[PDB]
DNA sequence: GATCCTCTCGAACGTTCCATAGCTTTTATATACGCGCCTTTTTTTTTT
């Protein structure tokens, strides 16, 4: 159900701006499933 | 001692442990300008 099941080993943020990275983790979207290797998240906190 | 004159140079020691203040913890930001190091970019390379 979008739900990233992984392990965080490198958040970066500059007061803005994330830089997430995961890896090793599995992806279940909306009646799909991914593993990834790895995954670099980069989210943006208002 | 050992002449004479010019003239040049630089209970103390441990032992325990409270008591002072700090420090360092993140995190806002302006700049330059440092490595840092990702990634793709970009090649060089190997095989078919």
């Known amino acids: 159900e979008n739900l990233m099941l992984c ?7 500059t007061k803005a701006r994330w830089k997430c ?8 979207i909306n009646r799909n499933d991914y593993t990834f290797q790895k995954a670099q998240v980069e989210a943006e906190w208002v």
């Open 21 to 28: 990275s995961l890896k090793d983790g599995v992806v279940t």
């Open 7 to 13: 392990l965080y080993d490198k958040v970066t943020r």
